[PDB]
Amino acid sequence: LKVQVNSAAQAVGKVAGDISPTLAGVLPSWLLAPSATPPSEAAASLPHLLVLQPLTANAQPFYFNLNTAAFDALQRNSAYNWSGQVRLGRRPALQSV
Amino acid sequence: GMGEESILLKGAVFPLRRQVGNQEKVVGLEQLEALRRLAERREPLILSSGYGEVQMGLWCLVRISENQSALLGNGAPRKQTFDLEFKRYGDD
Amino acid sequence: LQLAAYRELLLRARINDAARAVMLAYASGADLDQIGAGFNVQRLLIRPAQPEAVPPVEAQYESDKSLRNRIQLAFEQLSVAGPRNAYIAHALGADGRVADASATSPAPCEVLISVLGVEGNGQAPEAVLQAVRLALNAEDVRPVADR
Amino acid sequence: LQLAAYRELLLRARINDAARAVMLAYASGADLDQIGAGFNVQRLLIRPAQPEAVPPVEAQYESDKSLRNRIQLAFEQLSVAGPRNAYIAHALGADGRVADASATSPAPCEVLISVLGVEGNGQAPEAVLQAVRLALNAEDVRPVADR
C-alpha cells in the first residue's frame, strides 16, 4: 500500500498538480518589535529616585518618582561570610569564605 | 487533603457569682473540672450550637488551660480564665 | 466535528443496540419477543390483564430473565413419543397414577405401554384407559399400533 | 463534506460487517458461541489446557465451519421420532468418524445407515461402530430397529 497508493498519488499529481500553499499570516516587521522610544515617565518634570532596568536592554525601564512609586525608606543589608571554626583551647578561627 | 480544622473557646468562669435568679447556689469550683473529666474519656464530642448549622461534627478536645487567680484563703479562686481547643475528628 | 463525533457515536451505539437485540444472551424488552415468536414461546401472565376496579391493574408479565430460561428450554421439551423415555412422559395426562415403562414385542408395527395407576390395589381403571389414548393419537409417530 | 462522505463509507461498512457476523453466513470466531447459545450449541474441549508442564500450555477448542454445521444441525435434533437427519445429527457425536447417510431398502422398521469414517485408509474399526448404538438409545423410536 505504501508502493501502490504512492504510485497512484504521484500519478494524480502529474495529471493535476496541487494548489500552492497560499499565505495569509504574513505580518509586517512591527508586531514583534519593541517601541524603543522612552515613555512619558522619563520625560516628566520630576527627578527620578531610582531606576530599574533589565538585561535585554530594549525593554522598558521602571522609573521611581512621585508619579510612579516614590519610596521613602531604604534598607540595605550586606553580610560578609566569615565562617567560624571552633578550636579547642583557644578562640575560634574565622575565615573569609 | 483537608487539613486540621480547629475551634478555640476563650472565656472566664467566676466561681462566686450566684446562679441566675438567685437559686441559693453559686457557680462552682467543680464546674471547670467537669470539662477535664469529660476530656479524659479519649473520645470525640458533638458540638451543638443553636444559630447556623446545629449539627456540627465530631470534635475531640485537645487542650484545657485555666488561669485561676484572685485566690481565697484555702486556694479557691474567684476567676478562672480558660481556653479550650478542639480539633475536628474526621469520621466517615 | 463535535457533532460528527457525537452523532456517529449514536450510530455506533445503535449498531451495538441492534447487535444485542439479535443475541439471546443480551436481548431484552420487546427484542426477546422476536426471539420468542420464532421458537413458539410466549411471555407468561402471572396476574390477568383486565381489572374490575377504577385503578387499572397492570397486565403482569414475567421478567425477561425468565424468558432466557424459557427460550433455552424450548429444545429439551416434550415433542413426540419416540423412545421409551418419551412414551411415558407423554403418558402424563391422567393424575391418579405412578410411573410407567414401555415395550414393543414386534419391530415394525406395535408398541406396548402397561399403565398401572395407584388408586386402590393398583389396577388401571377403564376410565383412564381412554384418557391415555386421547393424548397418544397426535403425540406419537402416526403409524403406531399403540396397544 | 469530504470527511462526512468518508465516515458513512465507514458506517455502511460497519452495518454490513455487523450484519455478516449476525447471520451464520460469514460469522467469525467467538461469536458463534452467542448464536449457538440460541441453538443449544456449545463448543467442546479437544485436549484442553492441562499443564503436564506449566509453561507449555496446550489449549484447544472446537474450530469454526464444523461448529457452524452443529448450529445448522440444531433443528434436526429436536424431533426424537427420527426423521432423515436426526439419525445423522445424533451420529455425529463421536470424533473418530465422519457424517452419516440414511436409507431403507428392506421391510419397515429396518434402518440402513452407512457409518463412514475419515481416519486413514478406508475401513472404520468395528469397536468405533458399536458407539452409535450407545449414541442411539433414547434418540430413536422404540419400535424401529437399525442395522
Next chain:
Amino acid sequence: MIGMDRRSGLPLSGLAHLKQSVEDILTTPLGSRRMRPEYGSKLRRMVDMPVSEGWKSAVQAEVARSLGRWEPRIGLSAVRVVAVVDGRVDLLLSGVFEG
C-alpha cells in the same frame, strides 16, 4: 433507599421513608433496642419537664445529636416551639435535605 412502612407494611421509598426514619430516632429511648444501646433520643427524658428557654436549646442540642448519629441524609436547621396548650407543646422540626 427503599424501606417498608411501620404500619400497613407497604414499601415506601423516597421521602415518606425519610420522615419515618426521623420518628424512629425521636421516639425510641436509649437502650430500648436489642443489641443497639446507643440508638434513639433522650427526648423521652425531656418529656414532662417545664418549657423554659433552656429546655428549648437542650432539645435542639439533643435532636441534633440523635439525628447526627443515625440520620446522615438530614441536615437539621432549627427546632421551634410554635404553640402551647395544656401540656401539649409542639415543635416544628425543620431541616434541609442532604445525601
Next chain:
Amino acid sequence: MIGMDRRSGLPLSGLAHLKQSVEDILTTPLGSRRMRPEYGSKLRRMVDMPVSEGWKSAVQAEVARSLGRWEPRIGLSAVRVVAVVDGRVDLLLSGVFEG
C-alpha cells in the same frame, strides 16, 4: 491561528477570527455544546435582569471567567454600559490583546 468564519464559510485568520472567538464564548449558554459542558457564558442567565450597579459588576466578573477559560489570547480590561434604550443595554467590551 487560521479559522473559518461562522457565516459565509470564508477562512479568516488574524483579528476577525479573534472577534468571532469572543462571540462564540459570550452567546453560547453553558451545556449547549456537545460533550463540552463547561463551555460558554452565563450571560444568557443575565438576559432580562434589571440593570443595577451590581448587575454590571456581575457581568464583568462573568465575562472574565468565560473568556479566561477558552480565550487565553485576550486580556479583559473593562465592560461598561454606554447607552440604555427600552430593554437594549449595550456594553463596550474593551480588552487588550495578548499571545
Next chain:
Amino acid sequence: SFFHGVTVTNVDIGARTIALPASSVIGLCDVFTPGAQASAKPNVPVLLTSKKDAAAAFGIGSSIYLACEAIYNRAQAVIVAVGVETAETPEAQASAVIGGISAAGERTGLQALLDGKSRFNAQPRLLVAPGHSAQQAVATAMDGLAEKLRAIAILDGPNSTDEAAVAYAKNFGSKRLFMVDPGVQVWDSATNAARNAPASAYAAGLFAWTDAEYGFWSSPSNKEIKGVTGTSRPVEFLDGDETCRANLLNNANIATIIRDDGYRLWGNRTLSSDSKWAFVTRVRTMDLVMDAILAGHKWAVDRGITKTYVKDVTEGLRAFMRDLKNQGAVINFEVYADPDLNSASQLAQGKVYWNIRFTDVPPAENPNFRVEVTDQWLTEVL
C-alpha cells in the same frame, strides 16, 4: 383524652397569615366540585397559603387545586381563591367566571377578588383564570378588573398555532395583560402520561417567586419554572433576529416558555399600546411602590393639615423612596410638594397635592457587546 409521651404530628399547627407579602398575592378563579370533601362555598373568597389549605378547601381532582399546585410548586405564595360552579354551555361557563352583582349583596366570580382586602389583608396583584382566558369575554373581564385592582392579569392564548395566538393578542393593548400562550404539560402520577396544563398559573407562581426572592423591580422572565415538562408546541429559538417562533411571539408582545422544553419563561413585555408602558417592570414598579408608599404612611388620611403636616410627609416619602433607591427598586428620584395647585381654597376641602417623579431600572432584555481589541490605544495589527 390527652397523651403523655413523645408524639409525631403530621397536620398543620401554626398560623402563617402574619407576614403576607403584599406584592405577591394572587387572585384565582376556576371550577371545582363543592362536595363534602371541599369545605368552601363556591362564590366566596378563601385565603390559601399551602397545598394543605387547597386540599382542605377544594377537591384534589378539581382544577382549583391543579392551579394551586402550579403556584405552590415554585413559590411560597398567598392565593385568594374564588370558585365557580361548573356549567354546561361554555359561553355560559364564561358567564359564571365573570360573575357580577347577580346576588343580593354578594360579589360572585372574578368580582369577589375585589373583596380580597376586608377579608384576609390581600389586595391581589396577580390575576389568573387557568384555561378560562382563551375566551375574550373573561380576558376583557380580567382586563377591566385589573385597573380597579392595580394588578396585572396573566391570561393565556389558545393552545393552537402561533398566528392563532398572535391574532388573539391583537384584541388588547391595555397595559395590564401578560399572555403566555404555550400551555405547558406536566408529568402525572395517576395517568402515567403527559397532561395538559394551561400555563397561566405557572407564570403566577414565577412572579411570586420573583418579587419575594429577587424583588418586584426585577424582571420575572428568565427564571425557572418548577412542576413542568415539555410544552404543547415545540417553540424554537436562536440568536440573530431570525424567523424563530420565539422572536415572533415576543415581537407580538407575547411571552412564552422557550428553552429545553419547560425550563424557563422568556419575554417581559405586556399587552400595551404605549411604548412607555411596554415592560411589566414599568407597570409593576408603578403600582408596587405606590402601595408600598402607602403601607407605612397610612397616617396620611388623618392628622389634619397643619403647618408641619405638608412638610411631615414630603420627607416622609423622600426617606422611604431613598430606601427604595438604595435597594435598587428605583434609580434617582425627586419628591416635592406641589407649589401651584396647592391652595387654601381646596386645602379646607381636604385636597393637598404632592409630586412624585422617579425613574425605574430597565431590564436588560438585549445586551449588546461591541468587542474591541488593542495593545495600548489602537489596533496595532490594523
Next chain:
Amino acid sequence: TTCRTADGDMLDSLCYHVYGHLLGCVEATLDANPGLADEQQPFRAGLLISFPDMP
C-alpha cells in the same frame, strides 16, 4: 438511579449532571439502556434512563 426526561433533556447533559464528568460516561449510559440510541437525541418527555454506576 433511573431518571425521567423532559422534551428537551439531552443525554450528554444528563449524565454530566448525574456523574460530574463526561470521560467514559455517555457510552456507558448507552450500553446499559436498550433502544436508547435508536430514539432521537432531542428526547421525548417520557423516556427513562437507568444510569449505571462506575461509568
Next chain:
Amino acid sequence: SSRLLPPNRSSLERSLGDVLPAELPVPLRELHDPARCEAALLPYLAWTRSVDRWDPDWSDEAKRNAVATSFVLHQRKGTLTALRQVVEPIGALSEVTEWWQRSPTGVPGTFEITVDVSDRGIDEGTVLELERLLDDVRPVSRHLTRLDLRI
C-alpha cells in the same frame, strides 16, 4: 442535527448540522424476523432455520411462513400434526388413513400411509413434488414409498 447546535448558529452551521451527521438505517434486527426480512436475503434465514425443501415459485406469504413455522415443523417431524402444515403452499387438508379403517389387521407392510391431498390452485404437474416434499417429514423406515393423491 440542527437541534443539537447551540442557539447561536449561522445558516451555514445549521446546514452543516443537517448534513455532516448523515444518519443511516440500521437493518440489523430485521434479519431474524422472517416477516421483516427483505426478499433478496430471505433464503439466508431459511438456511439457518434449516428449511429442508424450498421452491423459487411460491408467494412470499408462502415463503415466510415456511421460515416462521420452521421451528414447529422441525420440532415434530414424526407426527401427523406437522405433516398437515408441511403442505402449506399446496393448500390441502382433506383426509388421512389410520389402522382400524382397514379391517384385515392392516396392509402387508404394517400400514404405510396413503394420505389424501386436495389441491385446487395448480392442476398441471404438481404431483412429482409431494413424494419428495413429504420425505423429510417421513421417517427413514417407518413408512414405505406408497402414496395416494387427488386433483
